[PDB]
Design a binder for this molecule. Structure first.
Ligand SMILES: CN1CCC(COc2cnc(-c3cccc(Cn4nc(-c5cccc(C#N)c5)ccc4=O)c3)nc2)CC1
Length: 285
């Protein structure tokens, strides 16, 4: 139980456009589609204002206990609503129950996370398809970066893939969670200082590209998490994947430049990757 009434009228009124009524949402607690640390993702059914059934994903957030966490939850709801972009996940809304825990209502992503999609043997993406997925991620990050938003957790498992094989940058705001660590996707300066910028997201994006070109191989499998900073300070980097073209491996290496100023912007990455994308032939997705 959490008291909706005695929160903060000015804040609560600012949230109203994000709020969903509990009557207007069905959550299928029997059908789990994802596991995080802060909560699981379920199949839900939303009813929009004209009364049409929309198939959605619903994340619970157990641990959102005190008024601080509940207030911060609403603010993240506000932030997410103001983002609109084809390669960025959108928030449908939030549902504060009378008795139960708060619920994050999200669009259903038919083909799940990008890492599990590429890892699955049933799926057969071409080299062009994989470059295309990376290009889509870059466009989302270009949008977020233009809104002065730092992700801090960009990785292939944290991007989702919809019915039309459109990649959505996900795992931010209310959808932030450890899904089923991030040290191996962190920029060298972030490992030492714990300070995150758009240029640290560029590093992480580089590793995400390596994930795509390996079809979801775990990075640095033989390097222990504690000595990763030392590995990178010796200049050691992820090797070129078997079916990764040279010009795209050059892109990855530029993302892993130790000085952050010298890394490309996401704007630059969209240009460079779309140029590389325009030399390949043949797409399954
Ligand atoms: C075989 N399998 C049957 C079920 C099918 C449908 O599954 C779906 C799973 N998840 C969603 C969903 C949509 C929007 C937002 C979120 C929350 N969120 N989750 C993840 C996430 C989910 C599951 C596993 C992993 C990992 N590792 C990561 C990452 C970022 C993020 O923001 C989830 N939609 C559908 C897929 C095929």
């Amino acid at each position: 139980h959490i008291d909706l009434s005695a929160l903060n009228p000015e804040l609560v009124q600012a949230v109203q456009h994000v709020v969903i009524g509990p009557s207007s949402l069905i959550v299928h607690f029997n059908e789990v589609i994802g596991r995080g640390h802060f909560g699981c993702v379920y199949h839900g059914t939303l009813l929009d204002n004209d009364g049409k059934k929309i198939h959605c994903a619903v994340k619970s957030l157990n641990r959102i206990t005190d008024i601080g966490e509940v207030s911060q939850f609403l603010t993240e709801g506000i932030i997410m609503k103001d983002f609109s972009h084809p390669n960025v996940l959108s928030l449908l809304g939030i549902c504060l129950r009378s008795e139960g825990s708060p619920l994050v209502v999200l669009p259903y992503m038919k083909h799940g996370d990008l890492r599990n999609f590429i890892r699955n043997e049933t799926h057969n993406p071409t080299v062009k398809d994989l470059i295309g997925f990376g290009l889509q991620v870059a466009k989302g990050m270009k949008y977020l970066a233009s809104k002065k938003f730092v992700h801090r957790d960009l990785a292939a498992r944290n991007c989702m893939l919809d019915e039309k094989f459109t990649v959505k940058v996900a795992d931010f705001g209310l959808a932030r969670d450890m899904y089923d660590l991030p040290v191996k996707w962190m920029a060298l300066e972030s490992l030492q200082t714990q300070k995150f910028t758009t240029k640290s997201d560029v590093w992480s994006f580089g590793v995400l590209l390596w994930e795509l070109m390996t079809r979801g191989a775990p990075p640095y499998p033989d390097v222990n998490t504690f000595d990763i900073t030392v590995y990178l300070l010796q200049g050691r980097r992820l090797l070129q994947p078997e079916y990764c073209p040279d010009p795209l491996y050059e892109v990855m290496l530029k993302c892993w430049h130790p000085k952050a100023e010298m890394r490309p912007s996401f704007s630059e990455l969209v240009s460079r990757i779309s140029a590389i994308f325009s030399t390949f032939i043949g797409e399954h997705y």
